[PDB]
Amino acid sequence: GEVINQPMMMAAQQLHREATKWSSKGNDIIAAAKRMALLMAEMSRLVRGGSGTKRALIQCAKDIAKASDEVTRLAKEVAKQCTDKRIRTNLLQVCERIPTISTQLKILSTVKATMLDEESEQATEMLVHNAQNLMQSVKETVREAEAASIKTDAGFTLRWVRKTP
Amino acid sequence: VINQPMMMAAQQLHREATKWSSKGNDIIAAAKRMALLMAEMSRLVRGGSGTKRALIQCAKDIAKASDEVTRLAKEVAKQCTDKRIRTNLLQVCERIPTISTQLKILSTVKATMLDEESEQATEMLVHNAQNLMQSVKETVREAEAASIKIRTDAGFTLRWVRKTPW
């Protein structure tokens, strides 16, 4: 039913809330962020699964990583054309952090995967810690990239259409 | 474990709003936004310290969305021809502001606690949150019924189109 990993969920959701403020039309980062939010949530379900979700647990962390690569990719392109020195620095900071995290998530998920023994319990904690860092970094990426779309001869554009009530 | 009473109320608020497309309807969009924020909150009550920013932020956005729901419901009521519908609509545009303001207060006091005292802070928050979700559900329905009998000289319009049912 709903025996999901709640700390992966509050973390997945805390991301979702940020991305859901927008439209995905003309914004692949926003779309990849929502996808990441749904995958992390999906991982949240299977993560505690006994057997047969092993393949699933890695498809999940594989797709997440793939989406992270795209978020990183797009954020680099956003930063390249940013005129602002500070914004660009911050943006570049996460396009360094995101790859590290995503790669580690893949490693850690595969672990908790083959484990389906206190060691198993720690494998969970390490995965949760990492997952949380990923969701945070992506949230931070979304905000820096939105601020970078405010501030000449560029042809790249992320559409930031919000639903501010 | 997520506060089940809080999640349940968000779940039902969401069930009601998810029947409508958000295109041409800000109340429906603010309601979906509210259901989801309340869902996240149900995961924040239990959660360990440091997530309080998350809780304080959550309450803040919820209140902001409640204000917008209230503001739009007033405008819907102004042009409602129906005396009864308009009365009911106006009743909630009085209730919601009270609740939303209290939710903000209660969420903050609860965030500082992340002990009977703390446990009571939870119960007060849950009670309040439930009232909010109910009122918004009631607002959605009265506003949908108010879009059936509208004023002829009107320029305001909420689009009420079903999605699952089509």
Swiss-Prot record, chain A:
<feature type="region of interest" description="Facilitates phospholipid membrane insertion">
    <location>
        <begin position="45"/>
        <end position="88"/>
    </location>
</feature>
<comment type="subunit">
    <text>Exhibits self-association properties. Part of a complex composed of THSD1, PTK2/FAK1, TLN1 and VCL. Interacts with APBB1IP and NRAP. Interacts with TLN1. Interacts with CTNNB1 and this interaction is necessary for its localization to the cell-cell junctions and for its function in regulating cell surface expression of E-cadherin. Interacts with SYNM. Interacts with SORBS1. Interacts with CTNNA1. Binds to ACTN4; this interaction triggers conformational changes. Interacts with FLII.</text>
</comment>
<protein>
    <recommendedName>
        <fullName>Vinculin</fullName>
    </recommendedName>
</protein>
<comment type="similarity">
    <text>Belongs to the vinculin/alpha-catenin family.</text>
</comment>
<comment type="subunit">
    <text>(Microbial infection) Interacts via its globular head domain with the central portion of S.flexneri IcsA (also called VirG).</text>
</comment>
<feature type="region of interest" description="C-terminal tail">
    <location>
        <begin position="6"/>
        <end position="165"/>
    </location>
</feature>
<feature type="region of interest" description="Facilitates phospholipid membrane insertion">
    <location>
        <begin position="154"/>
        <end position="165"/>
    </location>
</feature>
<comment type="function">
    <text>Actin filament (F-actin)-binding protein involved in cell-matrix adhesion and cell-cell adhesion. Regulates cell-surface E-cadherin expression and potentiates mechanosensing by the E-cadherin complex. May also play important roles in cell morphology and locomotion.</text>
</comment>
